[PDB]
Design the sequence.
């Protein structure tokens, strides 16, 4: 599947422009949103969530607002380069 190459990189770190270093924790759809998403933990409260959305847990965050869902297309090349 198209998400498999990104799913293999879960647990890696990427350097998201204008945000900072984030750990990739989830790749996939999000209920009620269009398209595929990367769930990242920014390891500081500069995200928007705790890894859950609409009462469902997608991933774990270190802090209450360190999690962020980003449209996968925006970070796909960064995730590919991560090792």
Sequence:
């Amino acid at each position: 599947g198209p998400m498999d190459r990104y799913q293999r990189k879960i647990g890696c770190f990427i350097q998201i422009p204008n945000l900072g270093r984030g750990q990739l924790k989830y790749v996939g759809p999000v209920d009620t949103k269009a398209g595929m998403f990367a769930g990242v933990d920014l390891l500081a409260n500069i995200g928007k969530n705790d890894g859950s959305f609409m009462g469902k847990k997608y991933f774990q965050t270190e802090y209450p607002q360190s999690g962020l869902f980003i449209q996968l297309q925006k970070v796909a090349s960064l995730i590919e380069k991560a090792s």
About this structure: The first helix runs from residue 4 to 7. Residues 1-83 form one domain. The chain has one domain: 1-83. Strands lie at 13-16, 20-29, 36-41, 52-53, 56-57, 67-71.
